[PDB]
Amino acid sequence: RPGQGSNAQFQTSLADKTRGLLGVGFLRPTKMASFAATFLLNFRFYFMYMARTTFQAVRPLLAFSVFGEVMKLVLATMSSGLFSFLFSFVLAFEVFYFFLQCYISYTFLTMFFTVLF
Amino acid sequence: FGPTLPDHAYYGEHATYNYFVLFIRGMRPYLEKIFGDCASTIKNAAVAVYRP
Amino acid sequence: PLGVKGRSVFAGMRSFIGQRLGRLYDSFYYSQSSTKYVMVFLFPAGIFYTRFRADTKLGYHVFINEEKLYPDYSQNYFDTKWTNGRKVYLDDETTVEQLKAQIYGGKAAPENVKVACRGRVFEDADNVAMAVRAFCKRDPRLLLFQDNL
Amino acid sequence: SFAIPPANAAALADPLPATPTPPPVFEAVSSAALKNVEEVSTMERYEAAVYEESFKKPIVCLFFARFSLQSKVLLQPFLDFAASASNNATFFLIDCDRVPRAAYHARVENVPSLVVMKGDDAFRQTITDSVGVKTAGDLIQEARSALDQVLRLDQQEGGTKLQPGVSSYTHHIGVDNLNVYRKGWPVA
Amino acid sequence: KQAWHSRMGKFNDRSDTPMLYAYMNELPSWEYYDLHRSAFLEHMTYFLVRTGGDFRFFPEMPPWQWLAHMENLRFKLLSVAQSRRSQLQLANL
Amino acid sequence: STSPGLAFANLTLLLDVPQLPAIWAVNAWRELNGLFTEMKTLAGTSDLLYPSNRYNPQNEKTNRMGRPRKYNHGEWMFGNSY
Amino acid sequence: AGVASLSAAIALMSVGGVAQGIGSLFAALVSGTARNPSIKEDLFTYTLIGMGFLEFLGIICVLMSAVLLYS
Amino acid sequence: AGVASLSAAIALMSVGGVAQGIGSLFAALVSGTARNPSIKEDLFTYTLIGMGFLEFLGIICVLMSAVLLYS
Amino acid sequence: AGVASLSAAIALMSVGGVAQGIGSLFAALVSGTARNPSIKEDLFTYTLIGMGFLEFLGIICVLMSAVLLYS
Amino acid sequence: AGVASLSAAIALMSVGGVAQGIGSLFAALVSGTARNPSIKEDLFTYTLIGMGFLEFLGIICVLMSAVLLYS
Amino acid sequence: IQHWNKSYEKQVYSESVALNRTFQARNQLVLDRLKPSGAYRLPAVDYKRQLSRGTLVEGADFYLPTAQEQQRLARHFEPYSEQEQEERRKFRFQSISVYLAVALGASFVHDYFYQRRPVAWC
C-alpha cells in the first residue's frame, strides 16, 4: 500500500493514548485562563470611549450653560454704561466660542460614529 | 505541529456579499407573502368596519 | 417556486434546525481551543448561575456587632477573615438557627447570640423570610449581637 | 495591505497544450466519449448539468488533472463503474485547469476527486484521498456506497427529503462571486 | 474598490493597529506560513514529493500523518548531523 | 462594524444578551411553580394558600407567618380554627 | 470635608501640565503649515489624535478630582 | 482616611509630565510629516511604539493611585 | 497609616517624570528618522538602549513604591 | 513615624529628575548621528561617558536614600 | 558547556518525540472520530483565495431582485410598462394629509392608551 510505510510508525503506548485523550499539551488551561484574564481586562476600552464620547457631547452644553450662568451673574451685578459697553464684546466672544466648541464636537463625533462596514 | 485551522476560521466574510444579506434576500419572498397577507387581513377588517 | 408538494413546513423547519446545528458543530470544531471552551461553557454557565440565583433566591446583608463574635475562618481557604455586609443567599425554609450555624461554620457559637433587623429581635424558631417580611420589609440587613442584658 | 498582481500571459495561456507522442517502441513496456460518460469542456454545460440533470437524476463527476498519476490510474475503473451504473445516474469527466469554475463549485481541493451530486446541494458527497492511503478500488467502493445512499434517500418519502439547502439563497456567490452576473445583480 | 480593499485590509491584516488579530494562539494556514517560512518550505517539499502535484493544489491545512512523518525525518536528520558534529567539529578545538 | 461611540451598546449587548437564557429559565421556573401550587390547591389544603406570595408555611400547627398557632391544642366543634 | 477639597485641588495640577503639550502640539501644527502649506490635511489628523490623547488625560484628572471631592 | 485622598491626588499630579511627553512626541511627528512626508509609515509606527510605553506608564500612575485610594 | 501612602504617591510622580523623558527620546528619534531615513536601524538601536535604561529606572521606582506601601 | 519613608520618596523624585536629564543626552545622540554618521562611534562614546556620569550620580543618590531609610 | 547544551538539545527533542506520540494518539482517537463530514461546511471562500483565483467581485452594496427591474436602463424604450407608469404617477409628491392622519392617530393612541398616568383629585 502507499501509506503503510508511514502508518507503521504510528503505534503508541497506553500512557501515550491516555495522555492524548486527556489532551495535555493541546488544551492548555493556563492559556484559557490567560485568555479570560486578557478578555476581562479589555473592558476598560469601553469605559474610556464612553467617557470621551460624553465629554464631546456635553462640551457645547457646558459652553452654553455654565459660561451663560457666569455672564448672567455679571449682568445681574453690573449697572453702569461703560462696563456694559465693554461687556457686550465679552458676550459676542462667547457666541464665537460656542460655535467653535460646536465645530470641535461635530468633528470628534463624526470621528467617533464613523464605521467602515 | 503546523496549522490546525483553515483560513475561513479567522478571516472575515465578504463585506458586500455576506451570509446574512444573502440569507435575507433568499427569505424575501416568504416574508412578502406573510406581511402582505397580514396587512390585507387588517385592511379588510378595517374596511368592513368603516364602510357601514 | 415556493414550497413543494408532499412536503410540510414542519419538515422544512426540522431541515433548517439540522442545518444550523451542523454548521455550529463545524464552526466549534474549527476554532481555537484556548477561547471557545471558555466563551461557550464557562462564561455562560457562570452568568446563568449568578442571574438565576439573584432572580430566584433572596439574600441578606449580614453584620456582627463586635469583633469578638466574629467567626474563625483561618482554616477555610479563599476567606481568612470575616467582613461585615456580606451578601448571603438563603432558602425560604431557613431558620435563625440554621443561619447562625451557616455563619459560624457548624461550630460552637458564642452564648446568647441573637439576630436583629431594624432594632427588632428575632426568635430562633422563626423563619427568616417571614420575620424580615414582618419587621424589616425590603431592608433585609441583619445584625448578630450578644443578648446578655 | 494585501495585493496580488492581476495576471500574466503565462497564467492566461492555454493550460493544456499538446506534447510530442512517442513511436510504438516506448509503449512496449513490461506493464502494458466511451459511450457511458460525458467529457465536460464548458461551464455552460456544467451548469446545465448541475441545475437540470442533477435535479432529475443524480450525477457523478470526476475532477482530474493531467499531471496526476492517480487520475490516470482511476480513469479506467471509473469508466467501468459508469458502464455499470449509467442507468441510475449520469457520469461526467472534468479537467480542473480547463474548467476551474466547476472545480470551485464542487469545493474540490485535491485531485483526483469524485463528487456525487443531487439537487446541487440536497446530496453532495466528495470522495478523495487527501492523505495518500486509499486506492482506486477504495474510491470506487465509496462512490458506489454514496450512489446507493442517495438513490435510497431519493426514493425515501415520496421523492422528497432531498431539497436544496444553502444554494437556495446563496447561489454559490461566496464560493464564486461571478454568479452575481448570472443572477443579474449589479456590480457598479 | 479601493475603499473595499483598504477596509478589508485594515480589518483582517496583522498590523500594529490590529482589529481582528487578537487572542491568537492557534494560527490559520496563511498567517502560520507567513510567520514561519521554515515550515512553509518543509510542508511544501513534502507535498510535492508525497503527491506528485502542483503548488496550485497546496492544501490549506496538512494532515497529522504528514506532520508526524516530517517530525520523524527531522529526528533522523538531526540525530545524524548532531552526532557528526559532536565527533568531528569539536576535536578541531 | 464598531466605533468608540458605540461603547454603550457594545457593553450593554455583551453583558445582557447572555442573560436572556437565564431570564427565560427564570420565567419557566416561575410558571412551573405556579402550576404545582395550583395543582396542590385543587387537590386540597387544610389552610389556604396565597398563590402570588413568596412562601406559604401555614399548616395545622403553623400560622401564616411561620409561628405556632395559638389555641390549637384542643379540638373544636366547628372543626378547624381557620 | 476639607481634605477632599485639598485632594481635588492637588489633582487639578495635571490640567496645567496638559495645557503644556497641547500648546506644543498646535505650535508644531503651525510650524508645519508654515514649512509646507501644500499639506494642511494629514497634519491636522495627527494633531487631533494627539490632542485626543491629552484630552483623555484631562478627563481622567477632572474625573478623579470629582471622585475625591465626593468620596 | 483623608490622607489616602491626598496621596491619590499627588499620584495623579504625574499626568502633568505624562501629557507633556506625549505632546512633545506628537509635535516631533508633525514636524517630521512636514519635513519628509513620504515616510509617515515609519514615523507613525515609531510614535505608536512611544505611545505604547507612555500609555502603560500613565496606566500605572492611575492604578497605584486607586490602590492607595482603597487600601 | 497614610504616611507611607504619600511616599508611594511621590514615587509615582517620579515615574511620570521618567515617562516624560521617554517621550522626549521618542520625539528626537522621530526627528532623526525624518532627517536621515537610511540610518534608522542604528538610531533605533540607540533609542532602544536608552529606553531600556529609562525603563529600568522606572521599574526601580515602582518597586521601591510597593516596598514603601508595606514596610 | 514615616519620615524616613518620605525622605526615600523625595530621593526617588530626584532619580526621576536624573532620568529626565538622561533623555536629553540620548536625544542629542540620535541627532548627531543623523547629522554625521561617520563620526557616530565617537559621538556614542561621548554619550556613553555622559550617561555613565549621570548613572553614577543616580547610584549615589540611591545609596543616600538607603542610608536615610535605615537612619 | 558543549556537553550540557548538547544534552539540552537531546532531551528537548525527547520531549518533542513524546509530544508527537501524544499528538498522533489524540488525533487518531478523538479527532478522526469527531471530525465533521463537510456537508455543513462554510458556504464561502476567503477573499484572498478568490483574489488569487481571479474570482472576486467587490460591488453592488444593493441589488435588483427582478429582471424587469434589472433591464430598465438597457431597454431604453419601455423602462416602465404603462400600468407601472400610471401607478408611479400617484407618488409625485409625499402625502402630508396621510402623514397628518397617521401622526394624529398614533399620537392619540400613544397618549390615551400607552402613556396614561395618575392625577390627584380634590
Ligand SMILES: CCCCCCCCCCCCCCCCCC(=O)OC[C@H](COP(=O)([O-])OCC(O)COP(=O)([O-])OC[C@@H](COC(=O)CCCCCCCCCCCCCCCCC)OC(=O)CCCCCCCCCCCCCCCCC)OC(=O)CCCCCCCCCCCCCCCCC
Ligand atoms: C446551555 C449552554 C448555553 C451555551 C450555548 C449552547 C448551544 C445552544 C445553541 C446555540 C446558542 C448560541 C447561538 C449563537 C448564534 C449567534 C452567534 C453565533 O455564535 O454564530 C456563530 C456561527 C458561526 O458563524 P460563522 O462561521 O462566522 O459564519 C457562518 C454563517 O453563520 C453560516 O450561515 P449560513 O451561510 O449557513 O446561513 C446564513 C445564516 C446567517 O447567519 C449569519 O451568519 C448571521 C446571523 C445574524 C445574527 C444576528 C441577527 C440579529 C438581527 C436582529 C434581529 C432583529 C429582528 C427584527 C424583527 C422585527 C420584525 C417585526 O442564516 C441563518 O441561518 C440565520 C438565521 C437567524 C437570523 C434571523 C434574523 C431574522 C430573519 C428571520 C428569518 C425567518 C426565520 C428563519 C427562517 C428559516 C426557516 C425556519 O453562526 C452559525 O453557525 C449560523 C448562524 C446562527 C443562527 C442562529 C442559530 C440558532 C441559535 C438559537 C439560539 C437560541 C438560544 C436559546 C436557548 C434556550 C435557552 C433557554
Ligand SMILES: CCCCCCCCCCCCCCCCCC(=O)OC[C@H](COP(=O)([O-])OCC(O)COP(=O)([O-])OC[C@@H](COC(=O)CCCCCCCCCCCCCCCCC)OC(=O)CCCCCCCCCCCCCCCCC)OC(=O)CCCCCCCCCCCCCCCCC
Ligand atoms: C408615537 C409613535 C408610535 C410608534 C413609534 C414610532 C416609530 C416610527 C418612527 C418613524 C419616524 C419617521 C419620521 C417621520 C416621517 C416624516 C416624513 C413622512 O412620513 O413622509 C410622509 C409619509 C406619507 O407617505 P407617502 O410617501 O406620501 O405615501 C402615500 C401613499 O400615497 C399611500 O398609499 P400606499 O399605497 O403607500 O398605502 C396606503 C396606506 C396603507 O397601505 C396600503 O397600501 C394598504 C395596506 C394597509 C393595511 C395595513 C395597515 C398597516 C399596519 C396596521 C397599522 C395600524 C394599527 C396596527 C394595529 C395592530 C393590529 C391590530 O399607506 C400607509 O398606511 C402608510 C404606512 C405608514 C407606516 C409608517 C411608514 C413606515 C415608516 C417606518 C417606521 C418604522 C417602524 C418599524 C416597523 C415595525 C417593525 C417592523 O408619511 C407616512 O405615511 C408615515 C407616517 C409617519 C408616522 C408618524 C410618526 C411621527 C413622526 C414624528 C416626527 C416629528 C419629530 C418631532 C416631534 C415633535 C414635534 C413638535
Ligand SMILES: CCCCCCCCCCCCCCCCCC(=O)OC[C@H](COP(=O)([O-])OCC[N+](C)(C)C)OC(=O)CCCCCCCCCCCCCCCCC
Ligand atoms: C454626527 C452628528 C454630529 C452632531 C453635532 C451636534 C453638535 C451641535 C449641537 C448644538 C445644538 C444647539 C442648538 C440648540 C440651542 C438653541 C436653542 C434655541 O433654539 O432657542 C430658541 C431660539 C431663540 O429664540 P429667542 O431667544 O429669540 O426667544 C425665545 C427663546 N426661548 C424660547 C428659549 C425662551 O429660537 C429661535 O428663534 C431660533 C432662530 C435662529 C436660529 C437658531 C439656530 C442657530 C443657533 C444654534 C446653532 C447650533 C448648531 C451649530 C452647528 C455647528 C456645526 C458646524
Ligand SMILES: CCCCCCCCCCCCCCCCCC(=O)OC[C@H](COP(=O)([O-])OCC[N+](C)(C)C)OC(=O)CCCCCCCCCCCCCCCCC
Ligand atoms: C412570532 C413573532 C415573529 C416576529 C419576528 C419574525 C418576523 C415575522 C415573520 C415570521 C418569521 C418566520 C419567517 C420564516 C421565513 C422562512 C420561510 C421558509 O420557507 O424557510 C425555508 C423552510 C425550509 O423549506 P424546505 O427546504 O424544507 O423546502 C423548500 C425548499 N425550497 C426553499 C428550495 C423550495 O420553509 C419551511 O419549511 C417553513 C419555514 C417557515 C416556518 C418556520 C418559521 C420560523 C420562525 C420560528 C423560528 C424558530 C424555528 C423553530 C420553531 C419550533 C416550533 C416548535
Ligand SMILES: CCCCCCCCCCCCCCCCCC(=O)OC[C@H](COP(=O)([O-])OCC[N+](C)(C)C)OC(=O)CCCCCCCCCCCCCCCCC
Ligand atoms: C435587540 C437584540 C439585538 C442584538 C441581537 C441579539 C442576538 C444576536 C447577538 C449575537 C452577538 C454575539 C455573538 C458572538 C458569538 C460568540 C461565540 C463564539 O464565537 O465563540 C467563540 C469561538 C472562538 O473561535 P476562534 O477563537 O477560533 O476565532 C474567533 C475569532 N478570532 C479569530 C478573532 C479569535 O467561536 C467559534 O468558533 C465557535 C462559535 C460557534 C459555536 C457557538 C456556540 C455553540 C456551540 C454548540 C456546539 C457544541 C459542540 C460541543 C462538542 C464537543 C466535542 C468537540
Ligand SMILES: CCCCCCCCCCCCO[C@@H]1O[C@H](CO)[C@@H](O[C@H]2O[C@H](CO)[C@@H](O)[C@H](O)[C@H]2O)[C@H](O)[C@H]1O
Ligand atoms: C430544557 C428545559 C430547561 C427549562 C429551564 C428550567 C429551569 C432550569 C433550572 C432548574 C433549577 C432547579 O433548582 C432548584 O431551584 C429552586 C429555585 O432556585 C431552589 O428552591 C429554592 O427556591 C424555591 C422558591 O422559594 C424553594 O424551593 C426554596 O425556597 C428553595 O429550595 C432549589 O433549591 C433548586 O434545587
Ligand SMILES: CCCCCCCCCCCCO[C@@H]1O[C@H](CO)[C@@H](O[C@H]2O[C@H](CO)[C@@H](O)[C@H](O)[C@H]2O)[C@H](O)[C@H]1O
Ligand atoms: C415551559 C414553561 C412555559 C414556558 C414559557 C415561559 C414564558 C413566561 C413569561 C411570561 C411573563 C411572566 O411574568 C410573570 O411571571 C408569572 C407567570 O409566569 C406571574 O407571576 C405571578 O403569578 C405566578 C403564577 O404562575 C406566581 O407564581 C407568581 O408568584 C406571581 O408573581 C406574573 O403574572 C407574570 O407577569
Ligand SMILES: CCCCCCCCCCCCO[C@@H]1O[C@H](CO)[C@@H](O[C@H]2O[C@H](CO)[C@@H](O)[C@H](O)[C@H]2O)[C@H](O)[C@H]1O
Ligand atoms: C380608538 C381605538 C384605537 C386602538 C387603540 C387600542 C390600544 C390598546 C393598547 C393598550 C395597551 C396599554 O398598556 C398599558 O398602558 C398603561 C399606561 O397607559 C399601563 O398602565 C400602568 O401604569 C398606570 C399608571 O401608573 C397604572 O394604571 C398601572 O400602574 C399600570 O396599569 C399598563 O401597564 C399597560 O399594560
